[PDB]
Ligand binder design. Structure first.
Ligand SMILES: CCCCC/C=C\C/C=C\CCCCCCCC(=O)OC[C@H](COP(=O)([O-])OCC[N+](C)(C)C)OC(=O)CCCCCCC/C=C/C/C=C\CCCCC
Ligand SMILES: CCCCC/C=C\C/C=C\CCCCCCCC(=O)OC[C@H](COP(=O)([O-])OCC[N+](C)(C)C)OC(=O)CCCCCCC/C=C/C/C=C\CCCCC
Ligand SMILES: O=C(O)c1ccccc1C(=O)Nc1cccc2ccccc12
Ligand SMILES: O=C(O)c1ccccc1C(=O)Nc1cccc2ccccc12
Lengths: 327, 327
């Protein structure tokens, strides 16, 4: 496998649908002037509460939880610990804005620009096309972590930052916020049902499965449409300027993949899992962190710029990493 | 073959998904109080402008236009002429409200409560489940005819009624209103591409087909969700009143199917096409007529009540007609 032009063409053909399903939303929100800002928020609200949860359930319910590789989980833990260590070290010698501010604020804006890629909508098709169906069952293990263990911790830290800017009270507030999250319930039920379907042999009734599919189908396309609407909402792609966009992208597409490579070497992962993990780490930034930043107002411009430009540059960077890892 | 409890169970299993995809929207708009009126309006706009056109294209491009049986088209013409004649006769004898309202206005109110059922969203799944895939290729003929000729004549009639309350000026205004419709463009390109595909042998490129599917997939589910939102919008199911609701249901589910039976007998249709036509005529009322009524303010209450109550009572009538025609 020399990465001939045929493979790159196949990846491009697999990724074009989810880019033309996004340019449509961008044009509708910006050029065609089809949706009002409140109307745009209506679509953005429906998708994140009906398609992302149902899509997450339909993606996580089709995996034997007992087959989850502990090595990949430990590699994820090690990566998201090393990134924290490096962020703490760098923030001790170079404040990004100069003027002193909450260190935890800059460590929470970090860990959202570095080690929380988009692994449901914009990250599943690309990796599946690049590495076939083998890699589609590996992201299905990292998505579970990102939805259960990492986003809950990020929410708790966001609440802590909002309060600081009793610990038990903060934990209780984070719990209340989490209980009303459709995605956490969807992924929890997905794993609980996958356990049953793979151990006891239970199968979803035709009615239930088809009802779930009706809304799950098109979840990727409409999620990309909503992401395009979000891009159209912003006045300019580079919200904070060149200085904080180059650094954002350098972090996301170097310190993430590089730290994942270091973690894999420490854990000594294997082929068909090392490359998948690295590409996952190299995926564009996720959206949920942007939602948290907007809700708690923690540098929304930086995270929005990172998300938008990383999503735009997904194909170049992802193809570059795919070519590099095959040497 | 025949009628038995297992067949009814299969029909119910095929229809339940598109009812639980609608109760979700109803609850989100009314009970859960999830969407503000502007947000639900935006969702409705998005679906009607992106999923209905794309779904129509993906449904009409598959069948062969050259296989369109002229007998079914002639039967549709005869039905929608007989309904006009009967409506004109009855209106002269007995005015519905007695307020000396415009006869043309009530005729336009008719021809939509009678002979314009929902054949894309709520008509294709039910009929396909009842009669397998044979009926799915017969509805597409009626679907394309309704989208092209009948929904253009109805638009022209609405414009004429609005002006009545120059003929060339009215035709020009109707043309302007028709041009901006995306559904008309989608249903036209559907045949323009099906002709090439079935005659010239051309096939959609993988990229184009997958891009179309991304948004077409789940179009039925989100269309039912939008229909549920619309149902939740209205304060009560029976808007105009009990008498008007009863008259609307009686018309839609007796005069439509009865006139279609008369037209089929006149044209002498055949088995596997007669029953499909009758059930199609017995489907619940369509939505586009409600959109026109709301835009031009032509008895929105009666049409909305008919649409909602037909959607709720779709199965008790479709199954009844299926049982009746199998004797
Ligand atoms: C606060 C205390 C009460 C907490 C809730 C209590 C109990 C658990 C709830 C439900 C049980 C069913 C499964 C979980 C669904 C959770 C749905 C959910 O979170 O409801 C609320 C959520 C809306 O969000 P919000 O409330 O923040 O609105 C805020 C709106 N404003 C900001 C404008 C005010 O609604 C949505 O997300 C829409 C629905 C999303 C559904 C996602 C799960 C999909 C699962 C499928 C599995 C199906 C079948 C399995 C069958 C197995 C056996 C055969
Ligand atoms: C008035 C003078 C200009 C008239 C138009 C001129 C030329 C024809 C246009 C386009 C050609 C491409 C195909 C047709 C697309 C038509 C799209 C359309 O109607 O744009 C407008 C429509 C939005 O409506 P509005 O503007 O009334 O909004 C008003 C909103 N407010 C009131 C708030 C301001 O946008 C939408 O619906 C969104 C897009 C819907 C797309 C539906 C068609 C899908 C087709 C698929 C076929 C694909 C591939 C085939 C490949 C073949 C070769 C291999
Ligand atoms: O993209 C992420 O951040 C992510 C990563 C792993 C698991 C889940 C998610 C996730 O909920 N995405 C999204 C949430 C809400 C709205 C979204 C709209 C578009 C794309 C992703 C969305
Ligand atoms: O349902 C109809 O009236 C119909 C019948 C035949 C062909 C097309 C249609 C049609 O455009 N429906 C719809 C239009 C706009 C929004 C809709 C939302 C939900 C369901 C149907 C819709």
């Amino acid at each position: 496998m020399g990465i001939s032009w045929l493979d790159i063409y196949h990846v491009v053909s697999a990724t074009v649908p989810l880019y033309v399903s996004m340019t449509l939303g961008f044009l509708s929100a910006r050029h065609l002037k089809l949706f009002s800002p409140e109307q745009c928020a209506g679509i953005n609200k429906f998708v994140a509460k009906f398609s992302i949860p149902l899509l997450s359930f339909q993606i996580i319910s089709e995996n034997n939880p007992f087959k989850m590789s502990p090595k990949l989980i430990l590699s994820d833990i090690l990566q998201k610990f090393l990134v924290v260590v490096v962020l703490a070290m760098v923030l001790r010698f170079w404040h990004p804005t100069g003027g002193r501010g909450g260190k935890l604020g800059w460590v929470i804006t970090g860990l959202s620009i570095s080690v929380l890629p988009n692994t449901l909508i914009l990250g599943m098709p690309i990796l599946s096309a690049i590495y076939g169906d083998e890699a589609a069952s590996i992201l299905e293990q990292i998505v579970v972590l990102q939805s259960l263990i990492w986003y809950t911790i990020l929410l708790f830290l966001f609440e802590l930052n909002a309060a600081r800017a009793g610990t038990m009270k903060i934990l209780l507030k984070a719990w209340r916020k989490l209980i009303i999250n459709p995605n956490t319930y969807a992924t929890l039920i997905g794993i609980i049902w996958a356990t049953l379907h793979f151990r006891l042999g239970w199968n979803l009734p035709e009615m239930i499965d088809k009802s779930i599919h009706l809304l799950s189908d098109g979840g990727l396309g409409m999620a990309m449409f909503s992401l395009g609407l979000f891009m159209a909402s912003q006045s300019s792609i580079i919200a904070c300027g060149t200085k904080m966009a180059i650094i954002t992208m350098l972090l996301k597409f170097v310190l993430g993949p590089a730290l994942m490579i270091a973690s894999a070497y420490c854990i000594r992962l294997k082929s068909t899992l090392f490359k998948v993990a690295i590409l996952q780490a190299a995926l564009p930034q996720g959206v949920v962190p942007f939602v948290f930043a907007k809700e708690y107002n923690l540098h929304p411009e930086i995270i929005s710029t990172g998300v938008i430009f990383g999503m735009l540059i997904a194909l170049p960077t992802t193809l570059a990493y795919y070519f590099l890892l095959d040497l």
